[PDB]
Amino acid sequence: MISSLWIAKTGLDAQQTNMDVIANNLSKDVAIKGQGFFQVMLPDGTSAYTRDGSFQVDQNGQLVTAGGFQVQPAITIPANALSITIGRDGVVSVTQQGQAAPVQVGQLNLTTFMNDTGLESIGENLYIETQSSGAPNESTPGLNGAGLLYQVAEELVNMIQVQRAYEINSKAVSTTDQMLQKLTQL
Amino acid sequence: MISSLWIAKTGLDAQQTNMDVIANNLSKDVAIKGQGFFQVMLPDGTSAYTRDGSFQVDQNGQLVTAGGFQVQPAITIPANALSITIGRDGVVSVTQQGQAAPVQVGQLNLTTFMNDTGLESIGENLYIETQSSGAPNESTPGLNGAGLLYQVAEELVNMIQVQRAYEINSKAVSTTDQMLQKLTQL
Amino acid sequence: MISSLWIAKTGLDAQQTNMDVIANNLSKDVAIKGQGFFQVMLPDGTSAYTRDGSFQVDQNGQLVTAGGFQVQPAITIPANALSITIGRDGVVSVTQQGQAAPVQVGQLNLTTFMNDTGLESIGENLYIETQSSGAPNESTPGLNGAGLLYQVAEELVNMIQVQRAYEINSKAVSTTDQMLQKLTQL
Amino acid sequence: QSSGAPNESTPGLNGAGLLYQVAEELVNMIQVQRAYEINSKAVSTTDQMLQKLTQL
């Protein structure tokens, strides 16, 4: 019985989890068509990975975001000139004030892991490597492992049903307990 | 009387069991349309069987799951290339970076038992062979014994009624005992 | 009572089934005006039957579909020439690069069964012959048994009502049980 | 692999002809889209039914 309670409980817990997961579903912008993650570093120098393509050039040049974080390895962008572009391969090229158009101002690197499941979620769809994930393997878009850069309610349904399930589960448990109490004592 | 108590007891026990059973009822995904189980091995090398189709390719190639467990016998998957497919027969074919499309990278094997009842439940719908089950017989989907890969509340009702039953049972027992006590002594 | 429960249960089960069935209701394209099924074979060589007219010519000529499956018996199509046509009788004729217009490149065969009910559903409106169905009888469109090739919510209503029915059924059962419990003990 | 290898030729020869020199879908989509709406409706009722049933 207690076990049953546990059993019900566990299921109920799942149901909530499922629903929650269900809930969790339903300026330069670069997207990765296929597999791979962009590699990113914090001010500490720790490396992190993310599919999120949104970047802004901050005060410092280095590919800095809304926060200021730059990109690796040896390639920054601290000028005005004309514009800049990110090619399909990830090469960054620009037209500039210093009267030149550089190619490969820097080229973005991409990473892949043996198991994505292993990755530890920092939040904001940023992830960190773990023992389980395996080490990151680096490459560039359009070569080897990586493709080129390109340029829900059902869950809710689930969650509702799953959520419902626990409600059922509780119901069953209660009855028994009542039964027990009724039984106690015959 | 004690016997009756036992009798009631046994029934009551069943009732709980029934209810519990009642409770127990009500990324590549492959399903088995007909009979058969997928064959799976742990890190120890022990073999287990399961209908559950959910698999993920882990860091190692071998059909590894959320845990990392691979699949038998001689067929893994440690690359990126393009994609991969599992045919109806269980053959795994892929399109790859190593400029080739392999067929039968490996073919999944299926197992059947003389009596499924005999199988010992590990949990998570995974089962192990026993003396009672008989040895696993191996085959492939779409041949011989096995069909191709394809691509509740009533219990509650029962349980409630069954649960109720014991409550009745206890009631009967109590009365007698009371009767006995009343009888004691006349 | 238990029987009644069963009775209710059975009805309830049906109600769901009915609703479900209710749910289940509401490039060359060839349609069969009257009776008959197209005959089709898998890579294994097993024969299957379907009314579905949709076919595509795959890389191999043989009437291959989105999958590649061809058609029987002796008639393929592996060329470009101009076009191709399927006559009312099922004859396939083409205009071709090999400077000829063939007639009866091949002619499609149609099959009929003593009882369609017997047919076993593979899915995707494809069926396989069974003992119950009887053997397929072959013919061509426009001859004998077969006509020439040509060139719902109510269910929902039902389902809802039927679904409702079980709800009623359960209600009745519950009352009795309550009655019993009330009765127990008077 | 599925496509097969490309076979090459020139326009006007063999396999290739010379170089020369919708809403219905919408209709479909709307109806099809509608369909799921129906589908959901059916499901909900049953669940409600179940809940109503639970417990009788």
Author numbering:
A (entry chain A), B (entry chain A), C (entry chain A): 1 to 26, 92 to 216, 226 to 260
D (entry chain A): 196 to 216, 226 to 260
What did the authors write?
Here, we obtained a ∼7 Å resolution density map of the polyrod by cryoEM helical image analysis and built an atomic model of the distal FlgG rod by docking a homology model of a core fragment of FlgG into the density map and also by modelling the terminal helices. The helical parameter was converged to an axial rise of 4.13 Å and an azimuthal rotation of 64.75°. The resolution of the final 3D image reconstruction was 7.4 Å (at Fourier shell correlation (FSC)=0.5). The density map showed radially arranged two domains, D0 and D1, with domain D0 facing the central channel with a diameter of 13 Å and spanning a radial range of 6.5–30 Å, and domain D1 forming the smooth outer surface of the polyrod with a diameter of 125 Å. The model fitted well as a rigid body into the density map, to the level of secondary structures, such as β-sheets, β-hairpins and loops, indicating that the main chain folding within domain D1 does not significantly change upon polymerization to form the rod structure. We thus built an atomic model of the FlgG rod structure with residues 1–23 (D0), 91–222 (D1) and 227–260 (D0), but we could not complete the model by filling the chains in the two gaps (24–90 and 223–226) into domain Dc, which connects domains D0 and D1, because the resolution of our present density map was not high enough to allow de novo model building of these two gap regions. The atomic model of the rod clearly indicate that the rod is rigid because the D0 domains and the D1 domains are both highly packed in all the three main helical directions: the left-handed 5-start, the right-handed 6-start and the 11-start (protofilament) helix, in each of the inner and outer radial regions of the rod, respectively. The D1 domains of FlgG are oriented more upright to form the tight axial contacts, whereas those of FlgE are more tilted from the axis than those of FlgG by about 7°, giving rise to an axial gap of a few Å along the protofilament.
The flagellum is made of three distinct parts: the basal body, which functions as a rotary motor as well as a protein export apparatus; the filament, a long helical propeller that propels cell locomotion in viscous environments; and the hook, which connects the filament to the motor as a universal joint to transmits motor torque to the propeller oriented off-axis of the motor. The rod consists of four different proteins, FlgB, FlgC, FlgF and FlgG, with an adapter protein, FliE, for their assembly on the MS ring. FlgF and FlgG are 26 and 29 kDa proteins, respectively, and together form the thicker, distal portion of the rod with about 20 nm in length and 13 nm in diameter. The rod is responsible for the stable high-speed rotation of the motor driving filament rotation up to around 300 Hz in S. enterica and E. coli and 1,700 Hz in Marine Vibrio15.
